[PDB]
Amino acid sequence: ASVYAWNRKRISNCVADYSVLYNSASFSTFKCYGVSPTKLNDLCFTNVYA
Amino acid sequence: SALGKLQDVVNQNAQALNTLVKQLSSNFGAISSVLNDILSRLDPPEAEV
Amino acid sequence: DSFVIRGDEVRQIAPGQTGKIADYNYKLPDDFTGCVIAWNSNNLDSKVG
């Protein structure tokens, strides 16, 4: 999507293997505020919005 | 009310403790007043802050 | 401690970072005291093939 019309995807009722993301070499910026993606593996959430 | 002088003491002490305990629910600027939540969400570098 | 990485990964040579390099190859401590120095080496470490 264009930035002015940024898309939002709701993630729910699923297992989130965050490793696939934070072990990948495909990203040049990967910056998490207030959380560690490794610890996300041990947490459950009610709202996730990519 | 005759024994108010004693009751006062009791109440005062109680109030103190209550406030003390309720002060455990404050953030003081942290992202969460629960130590275990901070530890469950942050690694040492900023969890320590 | 000397080595070679690719440019996008230089940011991982720093306390409190994650990624391939930080997780599996070279890890600085969170309380790291010292200096990190890095420079482009395309002229030395790259080959046409």
Swiss-Prot record, chain B:
Changing Q12H: In strain: Omicron/BA.1, Omicron/BA.2, Omicron/BA.2.12.1, Omicron/BA.2.75, Omicron/BA.4, Omicron/BA.5, Omicron/BQ.1.1, Omicron/XBB.1.5, Omicron/EG.5.1. Residues 7-49 form a coiled coil. Subunit of the fusion protein that is processed upon entry into the host cell. Mediates fusion of the virion and cellular membranes by functioning as a class I viral fusion protein. Contains a viral fusion peptide that is unmasked after S2 cleavage. This cleavage can occur at the cell membrane by host TMPRSS2 or during endocytosis by host CSTL. In either case, this triggers an extensive and irreversible conformational change that leads to fusion of the viral envelope with the cellular cytoplasmic membrane, releasing viral genomic RNA into the host cell cytoplasm. This is Spike protein S2'. The lineage of its organism: Viruses, Riboviria, Orthornavirae, Pisuviricota, Pisoniviricetes. The chain holds residues 943 to 991 of 1273 of the full protein.
